Scaffold this motif. Structure first.
Motif, PDB file in Angstrom:
ATOM      1  N   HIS A  41       0.706  -1.025  -0.007  1.00 20.50           N
ATOM      2  CA  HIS A  41      -0.006  -0.053   0.027  1.00 20.50           C
ATOM      3  C   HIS A  41       0.879   1.396  -0.023  1.00 20.50           C
ATOM      4  N   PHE A 140       2.081   1.079  17.806  1.00 23.39           N
ATOM      5  CA  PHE A 140       2.752   1.866  16.465  1.00 23.39           C
ATOM      6  C   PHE A 140       1.817   3.158  16.316  1.00 23.39           C
ATOM      7  N   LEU A 141       2.736   4.016  15.764  1.00 19.21           N
ATOM      8  CA  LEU A 141       2.117   5.237  15.372  1.00 19.21           C
ATOM      9  C   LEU A 141       2.196   5.361  14.159  1.00 19.21           C
ATOM     10  N   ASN A 142       1.901   6.553  13.188  1.00 20.44           N
ATOM     11  CA  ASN A 142       2.013   6.889  11.813  1.00 20.44           C
ATOM     12  C   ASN A 142       3.303   6.582  11.545  1.00 20.44           C
ATOM     13  N   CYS A 145       4.192   1.470   9.330  1.00 23.06           N
ATOM     14  CA  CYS A 145       4.213   0.380   8.404  1.00 23.06           C
ATOM     15  C   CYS A 145       5.603   0.109   7.794  1.00 23.06           C
ATOM     16  N   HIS A 163       4.349  -5.224   9.495  1.00 25.22           N
ATOM     17  CA  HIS A 163       3.192  -4.583   9.842  1.00 25.22           C
ATOM     18  C   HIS A 163       2.479  -3.604   8.673  1.00 25.22           C
ATOM     19  N   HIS A 164       1.197  -3.814   8.682  1.00 25.96           N
ATOM     20  CA  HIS A 164       0.481  -3.181   7.487  1.00 25.96           C
ATOM     21  C   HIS A 164      -0.460  -2.140   7.889  1.00 25.96           C
ATOM     22  N   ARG A 188      -6.974  -2.706   2.732  1.00 25.47           N
ATOM     23  CA  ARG A 188      -7.897  -1.419   2.288  1.00 25.47           C
ATOM     24  C   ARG A 188      -8.079  -0.724   3.502  1.00 25.47           C
TER      25      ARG A 188
HETATM   26  O1  LIG Z   1      -4.304   1.586   0.631  1.00 23.54           O
HETATM   27  C1  LIG Z   1      -4.249   0.922   1.792  1.00 23.54           C
HETATM   28  C2  LIG Z   1      -3.847   1.474   2.823  1.00 23.54           C
HETATM   29  C3  LIG Z   1      -3.009   2.687   2.910  1.00 23.54           C
HETATM   30  C4  LIG Z   1      -2.628   3.216   3.840  1.00 23.54           C
HETATM   31  C5  LIG Z   1      -2.689   2.595   5.234  1.00 23.54           C
HETATM   32  N1  LIG Z   1      -2.019   3.055   6.418  1.00 23.54           N
HETATM   33  C6  LIG Z   1      -0.592   3.740   6.192  1.00 23.54           C
HETATM   34  C7  LIG Z   1      -0.452   4.633   7.319  1.00 23.54           C
HETATM   35  N2  LIG Z   1      -0.820   4.071   8.818  1.00 23.54           N
HETATM   36  C8  LIG Z   1       0.183   4.033   9.647  1.00 23.54           C
HETATM   37  O2  LIG Z   1       1.374   4.691   9.513  1.00 23.54           O
HETATM   38  C9  LIG Z   1      -0.286   3.802  10.956  1.00 23.54           C
HETATM   39  N3  LIG Z   1      -0.866   4.722  11.965  1.00 23.54           N
HETATM   40  C10 LIG Z   1      -1.195   4.282  13.051  1.00 23.54           C
HETATM   41  O3  LIG Z   1      -1.809   4.933  13.826  1.00 23.54           O
HETATM   42  N4  LIG Z   1      -0.840   2.811  13.451  1.00 23.54           N
HETATM   43  C11 LIG Z   1      -0.472   1.860  12.658  1.00 23.54           C
HETATM   44  O4  LIG Z   1      -0.215   0.740  13.362  1.00 23.54           O
HETATM   45  C12 LIG Z   1      -0.104   2.325  11.388  1.00 23.54           C
HETATM   46  C13 LIG Z   1      -2.094   3.861   8.967  1.00 23.54           C
HETATM   47  C14 LIG Z   1      -2.450   2.561   7.774  1.00 23.54           C
HETATM   48  C15 LIG Z   1      -3.195   1.346   5.271  1.00 23.54           C
HETATM   49  C16 LIG Z   1      -3.830   1.051   4.178  1.00 23.54           C
HETATM   50 CL1  LIG Z   1      -4.834  -0.812   4.495  1.00 23.54          CL
END
Ligand SMILES: O=Cc1ccc(N2CCN(C(=O)C3=NC(=O)NC(=O)C3)CC2)cc1Cl
Ligand SMILES: O=Cc1ccc(N2CCN(C(=O)C3=NC(=O)NC(=O)C3)CC2)cc1Cl
Lengths: 306, 306
Positions: A41, A140-142, A145, A163-164, A188
């Motif tokens: 992703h 996990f924070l932003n 992944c 991690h996804h 998704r």
């Molecule tokens: O197109 C599909 C798609 C696109 C983006 C996506 N994200 C990426 C950024 N994210 C993070 O960095 C997390 N932020 C948190 O707060 N906690 C976590 O564990 C991870 C959220 C997920 C997920 C999917 Cl499925």
């Protein structure tokens, strides 16, 4: 003596973490030999997250859309492909710090160490278990992944988790390193829910043995039960049923303490029906289920690693 | 018109099946490019089955202990390795009939075709589903290990299952093609039990839509229910709960029949609480849960494959 939530030393994994950028999206990748692995992703924009078509999104990319950085050194992407939910980026330079490694898929109830990373740089390490509902209770924070989970067996790193995403309930979902999700989740950004979690019974028993080894004995008693009588009580408290295979696994702990598994089950049965009455076990007021029998042996017998 | 348990054409897979012999043990292997994949318990004797140590057993073998036959032609083994529960045998000749392929791990509730083989020769093909407890209700006799399960998407064969063993209850367990077991099973000949199975609700609804398309309408009614009211009844009858994702998946069938998903759920609710009263649906007196929504679309819309 003592008992701690102990993770594996992370050095062998820290040398494999890179930063992967595609467009305005940046996350972590795993660089082994001349391949970088990362969540697919990374190729999604805000418009695609709700219902991505990864085949279309990938064909519209070229190698130069992918910026890979190992600290300061930039890695030249010379090829790309998709394997299930993981993107595989072929690079021109093989990682000289590639350890002996393998890709394994773990089972619910097993534990592993997580190296949490941001912008390709390691931030912290912690231990967790794969829950019966195929989620993990991570931190996990932003930007996290692509962080990976791993065990170390001898000189070999077994990678088991990438991690996804975070689910609405605050728990975390991901794939093995072949890109196959743990649990019934898809990459998704829709509302997906995890099934009901249960308590990992064999792990609670291992932890009670660790308590006995460290001098906590107040919960023991003289009674004994059968596997069928215990499992009848366990099901009522949302505990996983206990198998003869579990009993065998606890063998080394039963021998070291001289307390038969079925004896310990009778103690657990009492703790479930009467609570702990304001007493603690190994510094906890709840029954802990994220140490496997092997974790306890490792920490109460002292295995190292090369 | 009509509705049958339909498998994929097996031709592309028949050309990849070989016989693998190690000692007095013979089973089936999958020959893609210059690698032959087979269950690792081919290296076990009667003395090892109860508790095999596969690392020791494999180091005591050499390439010439492995006899691989593709019909009449013998294949020369020039290398061997173990990947989880699968043995990978490198051979000197690449399979000229290697189709476009990939290795996928499927989810409970998904269906696939099984090519049952004995002594490397295909015997029959049938369709089955991966059950919620990670077993399959297959048809296998002695010598069937290494038979594979697959789907065909366009011109590409997706391999998802390799057969390893039969459980005491007569159901079957195996791995994906990376050697990772489906479910909490291990390749030892000990007594392992599967967890309780449940009925795949989204598949039953797809099958009811197939019935409507084929003129079976006696079970419909004017009522409608909510997702929460239905799931309350479903849990009491050991049915998997229904998610909004499932509702979306059934979209093409709801549009083709003009019957909303929640309308069909109300009909299913009635069938669970009152039975079928000696009537049949598509020639069955039970609710069928081994057709996915995609299976129904394929058979009621006519997708082919190249
Ligand atoms: O197109 C599909 C798609 C696109 C983006 C996506 N994200 C990426 C950024 N994210 C993070 O960095 C997390 N932020 C948190 O707060 N906690 C976590 O564990 C991870 C959220 C997920 C997920 C999917 Cl499925
Ligand atoms: O060392 C470990 C080990 C060794 C052997 C083994 N078997 C191989 C022979 N078998 C068959 O050919 C089947 N016979 C049936 O009746 N039904 C089937 O589905 C398959 C049984 C399994 C399994 C393990 Cl785990």
């Amino acid at each position: 003596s003592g008992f701690r939530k102990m993770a594996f030393p992370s050095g062998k994994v820290e040398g494999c973490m890179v930063q992967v950028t595609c467009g305005t999206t940046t996350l972590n990748g795993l660089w082994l030999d001349d391949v970088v692995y990362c969540p697919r992703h990374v190729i999604c924009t805000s418009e695609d997250m709700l219902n991505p078509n990864y085949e279309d999104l990938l064909i519209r990319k070229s190698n130069h859309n992918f910026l890979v950085q190992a600290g300061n050194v930039q890695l030249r992407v010379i090829g790309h492909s998709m394997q299930n939910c993981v993107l595989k980026l072929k690079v021109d330079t093989a990682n000289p710090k590639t350890p002996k490694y393998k890709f394994v898929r773990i089972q619910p109830g097993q534990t592993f160490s997580v190296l949490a990373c941001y912008n390709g740089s390691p931030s912290g390490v912690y231990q967790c278990a794969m829950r019966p509902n195929f989620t993990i209770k991570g931190s996990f924070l932003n930007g996290s992944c692509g962080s990976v989970g791993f065990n170390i067996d001898y000189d070999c790193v077994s990678f088991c988790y990438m991690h996804h995403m975070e689910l609405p309930t605050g728990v975390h979902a991901g794939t093995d390193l072949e890109g196959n999700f743990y649990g019934p989740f898809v990459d998704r950004q829709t509302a997906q829910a995890a099934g009901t979690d249960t308590t990992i019974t064999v792990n609670v028993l291992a932890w009670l043995y660790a308590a006995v080894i460290n001098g906590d004995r107040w919960f023991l008693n003289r009674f004994t039960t059968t596997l069928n009588d215990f499992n009848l009580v366990a099901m009522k408290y949302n505990y996983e049923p206990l198998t003869q295979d579990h009993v065998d696994i606890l063998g080394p702990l039963s021998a070291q303490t001289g307390i038969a598994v079925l004896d310990m089950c009778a103690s657990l049965k009492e703790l479930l029906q009467n609570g702990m009455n304001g007493r603690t076990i190994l510094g906890s007021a709840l029954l802990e289920d994220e140490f496997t029998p092997f974790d306890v042996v490792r920490q109460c017998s002292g295995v190292t690693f090369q």
